[model samples]
Target: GSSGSSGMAAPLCVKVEFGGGAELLFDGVKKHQVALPGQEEPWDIRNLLVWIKKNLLKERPELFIQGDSVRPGILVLINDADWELLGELDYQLQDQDSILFISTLHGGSGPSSG
Candidate 1:
């Protein structure tokens, strides 16, 4: 580790995205820039999941989260790579890292009407 001139620890910023119908669960927003606040413990995918549920999730949490991680039908990608190879929930989050969720399930599709 190296010391720097910063007075305090910096916030961790990451990119979160949704696709393959999963975006609907997040109010149809496909992308998000998240800044994880400084805490006693370092942020990981597992904790990030919980944070997302409490913060960014819009509706239908059951479709996006299961137990402590995402449901089976949904796939997680880290910086264009599969999360499976990156320690899944144990993967430590780094600044500017990109995390994406893509769903495989299909149901309905159409234009929204008011």
Candidate 2:
């Protein structure tokens, strides 16, 4: 009953940015001010993805979302912190939080932030 279709609540406004070539799916628009709809309870990352697919995503959604989570090779950063340190998909989003999506085309000899 946490899904948006499951009778959600008011939205949570957030800042979404696409990077590392991920912005291509969004017509090259890298930054987005989004308000994610909330659920009966707090909205988690799981619900956020659904909202993204519905409102933000414009093309090849499969490339960004897979089986309820982002496909392998995609990197998600929340509020400048590594999402891995924040519990991955289990993280609960807050209003005004910033989320970044790094494209799967990542590859380089340089240092990668974790």
Candidate 3:
């Protein structure tokens, strides 16, 4: 999904599932890049996800792709958990985490505010 605001698609997170019943969580978006407080930048969400997976290789990698018709245009959630809870555009992840990516399709008028 395209960042919409940034015109780029970036990864969200990386998760690991153990046999039987065990899950690990990691937040990739928070590992790289440094932005000022309340500042917005055109970042590729996919890049962040890739960064996390590169660091940790224990968890199996999975990518979810969907048709462009969902809300938020390109929404990315980790482990059924959203960065918004941790900190939209500022959320941090630990080691071994599950990341869920959801595509949000905007349904408003054309042309973005920016």
Q: List the residue pairs that clash in candidate 2.
A: none
Query: Which stretches of candidate 3 lie above 4 Å from their native place?
Result: 1-13, 16-72, 106-114
Residue-level lDDT tens digits of model 2 in 1-114 = 555465557778998998857777776787988876666777677778887776788876777776568778778899899889996888988788899888765455588788
Backbone clashes for every candidate come to 0, 0, 21
Top lDDT prediction, candidate number: 1
Mind sharing the TM-score for model 3?
Answer: 0.32
> TM-score rank, highest first?
1, 2, 3
Q: Residue 17 in candidate 1 has what lDDT?
A: 94
How does residue 70 of candidate 3 score in lDDT? 17
lDDT of 1: 0.81
Instruction: State the displacement of the C-alpha of residue 96, model 3, in Å, after optimal TM-score superposition.
Output: 1.4
Give RMSD (Å) of candidate 3 vs. truth.
16.8
